[PDB]
Design a protein around this ligand. Structure first.
Ligand code: HEM
Ligand SMILES: S=C(NC1CCCCC1)N1CCC(c2cnc[nH]2)CC1
Length: 435
């Protein structure tokens, strides 16, 4: 139930705000003082370290995220893409996605209700992954993956294998073990499979447009626009993969962690249920303004990201020798900023292991540069609002309609498969609730 990030936490607790650690077998310095987080993340003077993002660019030799929006480290090349794709994330575009978030969240609840016999185990990690994928495929690409209907198992498996491969490739000796040759081939096959799905969905979009079919603008419209000037489609496919994975798997892990922790927090669940009952009652469709009224649910989701941030770290390149909190750090060193580590430091959060949504209550002092599950600054998550809205819609509907009980034996530990996620798949038994 322990992960590599816990060793970084141990080194930070032992040695202070600036500590040399080994990550992806490269030397890095983890920086955990709030003033240093602010200095480096809030200035465009500091950019991502390409050496650390190579683990996403290519995996076991096969191009995966390439130079898409997450893994492009050059400021100019990144900014050019960001400006174009930001258009797909305006307040108005997001509100137009509430129909999609409601539709798939209601579909999830209806499937779960059909399974809510109080004894059959349901993997909530898998069900939330299927819901997040069906939401992203429709909202971003205008496609129906229907994973909630049991379709596209090869695609869901390919995603799982490549995320495991990201972690294996950057931390293990798999590339040299004869026993792992099959595993490496299957990771490379899964990465090529996903880029070829991108080729198909891109062709479907171009053909629909060529036939004069109506096509609302979405994320795919902007990733196509960002590549207008391109020799070929590899850059476009990098952003297809980037948004296909980032736009569903991290939200799914956040939802799974929240369901896992809430299963042992009856008092908190009672308040959430009462809040949903008072705010949305038996309404079928949640409105944008409804979400803002679910104040305690927002607190709960923020506390879930403090203790269980799926995207656990970000790196900036320190180009020249610099004194950081009194420690002289050599030039060309990757600096690691980790919301996972800071969230578990008693220096920044009293009784860090206690799950207490009141840390994010009205009037509570806001964490200052000690909490950043979507990172901060210019390279912060372009999908933050998309994610916060979709997770709230799914959680509100689950709280309205179902009661969960974790299957005895399921653990509360973590595992790393690119991002952090529950070690166990959050197997639960369900019963219908309320109206
Ligand atoms: C709870 C869910 C999510 C979490 C915790 C999260 C977290 C993050 C973090 C920490 C970063 C910074 C990564 C880095 O510095 O290496 C980031 C970047 C990014 N995220 Fe998310 N994310 C979430 C959901 C999403 C969604 C739903 C999308 C897409 C629709 C998305 C798209 C992206 C992209 C494209 C970037 C790169 C932004 C840039 O550099 O311009 N994220 N996210
Ligand atoms: S494993 C990972 N980063 C690690 C490897 C590259 C260096 C930083 C840590 N990431 C990038 C961000 C990505 C994401 C961004 N938004 C949702 N998901 C999830 C996968």
């Amino acid at each position: 139930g322990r992960v590599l990030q816990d060793v970084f936490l141990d080194w930070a607790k032992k040695y202070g705000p600036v500590v040399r650690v080994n990550v992806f077998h490269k030397t890095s310095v983890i920086v955990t003082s709030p003033e240093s987080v602010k200095k480096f993340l809030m200035s465009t003077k500091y950019n991502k370290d390409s050496k650390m993002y190579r683990a996403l660019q290519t995996v076991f030799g096969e191009r995966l995220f390439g130079q898409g929006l997450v893994s492009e480290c050059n400021y100019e090349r990144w900014h050019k893409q960001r400006r174009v794709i930001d258009l797909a994330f305006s307040r108005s575009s997001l509100v137009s996605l509430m129909e999609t978030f409601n539709e798939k969240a209601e579909q999830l609840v209806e499937i779960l209700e059909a399974k809510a016999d109080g004894q059959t185990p349901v993997s909530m990690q898998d069900m939330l992954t299927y819901t997040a994928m069906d939401i992203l495929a429709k909202a971003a690409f205008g496609m129906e993956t229907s994973m909630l209907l049991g379709a596209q198992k090869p695609l869901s498996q390919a995603v799982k294998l490549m995320l495991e491969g990201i972690t294996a490739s950057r931390n293990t000796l798999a590339k040299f073990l004869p026993g792992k040759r099959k595993q490496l081939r299957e990771v490379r096959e899964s990465i090529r499979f996903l880029r070829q799905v991108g080729r198909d969905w891109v062709q479907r979009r171009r053909e629909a447009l060529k036939r004069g079919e109506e096509v609302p603008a979405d994320i795919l419209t902007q990733i196509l626009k960002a590549e207008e000037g391109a020799q070929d489609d590899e850059g476009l496919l990098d952003n297809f993969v980037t948004f296909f994975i980032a736009g569903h798997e991290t939200s799914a892990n956040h939802l799974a962690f929240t369901v896992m922790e809430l299963s042992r927090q009856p008092e908190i669940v009672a308040r959430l249920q009462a809040e949903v009952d008072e705010v949305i009652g038996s309404k079928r469709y949640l409105d944008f303004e409804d979400l803002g009224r679910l104040q305690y649910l927002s607190q709960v989701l923020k506390e879930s990201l403090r203790l269980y941030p799926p995207a656990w770290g970000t790196f900036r390149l320190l180009e020249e020798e610099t004194l950081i909190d009194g420690v002289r750090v050599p030039g060309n060193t990757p600096l690691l900023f980790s919301t996972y580590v800071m969230g578990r430091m008693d220096t920044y959060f009293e009784d860090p292991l206690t799950f207490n949504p009141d840390r994010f209550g009205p009037g509570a002092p806001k964490p200052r540069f000690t909490y950043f599950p979507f990172s901060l600054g210019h390279r912060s998550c372009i999908g933050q609002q998309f994610a916060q809205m979709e997770v709230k819609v799914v959680m509100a509907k689950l709280l309205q309609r179902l009661e969960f009980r974790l299957v005895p034996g399921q653990r509360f530990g973590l595992q790393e498969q690119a991002t952090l996620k529950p070690l166990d798949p959050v197997l639960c038994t369900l019963r219908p609730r309320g109206w």
